[PDB]
Amino acid sequence: QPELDS
Amino acid sequence: GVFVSNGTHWFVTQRNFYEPQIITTDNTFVSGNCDVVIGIVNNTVYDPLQPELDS
Amino acid sequence: PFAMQMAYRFNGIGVTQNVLYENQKLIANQFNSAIGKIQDSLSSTASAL
Ligand SMILES: *[C@@H]1O[C@H](CO)[C@@H](O[C@@H]2O[C@H](CO)[C@@H](O)[C@H](O)[C@H]2NC(C)=O)[C@H](O)[C@H]1NC(C)=O
Ligand SMILES: *[C@@H]1O[C@H](CO)[C@@H](O[C@@H]2O[C@H](CO)[C@@H](O)[C@H](O)[C@H]2NC(C)=O)[C@H](O)[C@H]1NC(C)=O
Ligand SMILES: *[C@@H]1O[C@H](CO)[C@@H](O)[C@H](O)[C@H]1NC(C)=O
Numbered sequence: 520q521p522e523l524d525s
Numbered sequence: 526g527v528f529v530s531n532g533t534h535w536f537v538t539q540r541n542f543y544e545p546q547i548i549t550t551d552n553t554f555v556s557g558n559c560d561v562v563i564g565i566v567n568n569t570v571y572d573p574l575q576p577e578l579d580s
Numbered sequence: 581p582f583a584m585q586m587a588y589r590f591n592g593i594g595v596t597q598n599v600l601y602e603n604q605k606l607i608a609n610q611f612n613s614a615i616g617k618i619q620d621s622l623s624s625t626a627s628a629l
Binding site for chain 1 (some may be wrong): 576580
Binding site (some may be wrong): 527552555556562563564 | 601604622
């Protein structure tokens with residue numbers, strides 16, 4: 520989740 | 526584990542205790558095409574990053 | 581079923597089970613040839629007993 524916050 | 530059917534749906538369970546779960550890409554692996562395995566069955570494999578977790 | 585059991589015995593020696601489902605006919609042929617070789621090295625006069 521706290522990388523794929525596109 | 527093993528793929529089993531209750532008559533209508535398809536699950537994956539361990540071998541010495543019946544505990545059915547939903548077939549996703551986390552408890553399976555991919556190798557090859559659908560024409561070499563004798564007895565392959567058409568179902569669907571669930572992708573656990575696309576319920577809503579498309580941001 | 582017997583092929584699904586052979587796949588677990590393959591899984592138990594370190595080979596994956598898609599290796600058995602890919603090469604299934606070849607493996608069944610090699611087994612049948614080896615059993616046939618047993619039964620005529622027994623019928624000849626080679627005293628193994
Ligand atoms: C096979 O399994 C599926 C999934 O567990 C069953 O579908 C469920 O049936 C119950 C009724 O007791 C419903 O409350 C659920 O909503 C159903 N699940 C889904 C995802 O729709 C199905 O009934 C089972 N079939 C048999 C013959 O046991
Ligand atoms: C499993 O699913 C595939 C498609 O996902 C089926 O392949 C189709 O088969 C029919 C008739 O054999 C053809 O008319 C289609 O063109 C095929 N689709 C493709 C994309 O090639 C396959 O037959 C299914 N198997 C079973 C047993 O239902
Ligand atoms: C089970 O046997 C039937 C013939 O009785 C065959 O059509 C089917 O493909 C077999 N299922 C497998 C090998 O999963």
